[PDB]
């Protein structure tokens, strides 16, 4: 599924990401834009041979199992494939654990490089939430 901006904002809010660990909704929508372009089916191979999955590009090195990332953990206890669903529940539940890990949203290098410190409220402009 390719989400609309406001469509994704609404889904993340419903799932309690708005101001989760103090990150306003625009931060999450901004991260998803630059990680996935709002595409649940996005996959990207990392240099270390781990893979990033879904709207928030969650890494197989720590968070999900893909059966092909030697020495990896599955701290969200999910197949990485669950992170590609049109239903963002698994991505969101896993993202709550990641952002709670101690480095907050810096875990998402694209958030740190492209969203951090910017006018992230612009990402929810116009949305009926
Ligand atoms: Na893994």
Curated annotation (Swiss-Prot):
User: What superkingdom does the record give?
Assistant: Eukaryota
Cross-referenced CDD domains, in alphabetical order? Answer: LYZ_C (cd16897)
Expressed, tissue-wise, as follows:
In the egg white and polymorphonuclear leukocytes.
Q: Name the catalytic site residues.
A: 35, 52
Q: What is its EC number?
A: 3.2.1.17
Show where the C-type lysozyme domain sits: 1-129
* UniProt protein name: Lysozyme C
Q: Which source organism does the UniProt entry give?
A: Gallus gallus (Chicken)
């Amino acid at each position: 599924k390719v989400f609309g901006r406001c469509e994704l904002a609404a889904a993340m809010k419903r799932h309690g990401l708005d101001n989760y660990r103090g990150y306003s909704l625009g931060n999450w929508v901004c991260a998803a834009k630059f990680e996935s372009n709002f595409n649940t089916q996005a996959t990207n191979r990392n240099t270390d041979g781990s893979t990033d999955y879904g709207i928030l590009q969650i890494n197989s090195r720590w968070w999900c199992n893909d059966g092909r990332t030697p020495g990896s953990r599955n701290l969200c206890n999910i197949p990485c494939s669950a992170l590609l669903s049109s239903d963002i529940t698994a991505s969101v539940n896993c993202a709550k654990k990641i952002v709670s890990d101690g480095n907050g949203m810096n875990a998402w290098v694209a958030w740190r490089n492209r969203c951090k410190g910017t006018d992230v409220q612009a990402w929810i402009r116009g949305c009926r939430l």
